[PDB]
Amino acid sequence: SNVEPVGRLHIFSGAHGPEKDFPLHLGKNVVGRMPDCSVALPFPSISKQHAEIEILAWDKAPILRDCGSLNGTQILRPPKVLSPGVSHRLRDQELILFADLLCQYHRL
């Protein structure tokens, strides 16, 4: 197909199982437990619709928003707890927690 990834979300391996890599595309990339999510994370602590990474351009910082998750979305180095709907701009190599799951965003 035609869509070209403009980013990558890495889900670290751990107690929940092996690592995963998800391509991120222009527009809205939904993170959640639903199999239809752009970034599907089939784990009990992840909300059905957990967060959204919106990418407007390959060379502009994405927008991360929590979608009213139960267990939260957080940014590390330094710690930051995201309020539902509020824009957070992602930097290259950003470490993100969706609930208890550690992830890392990469520019391509």
């Binding site: 437990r33 639903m34 009990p44 602590s45 992840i46 909300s47 059905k48 998750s69 139960l70 267990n71 609930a99 208890d100």
Partner: peptide
């Protein structure tokens, strides 16, 4: 799908 499980 079932409800999200709170971290306890």
């Amino acid at each position: 799908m079932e409800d999200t499980q709170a971290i306890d």
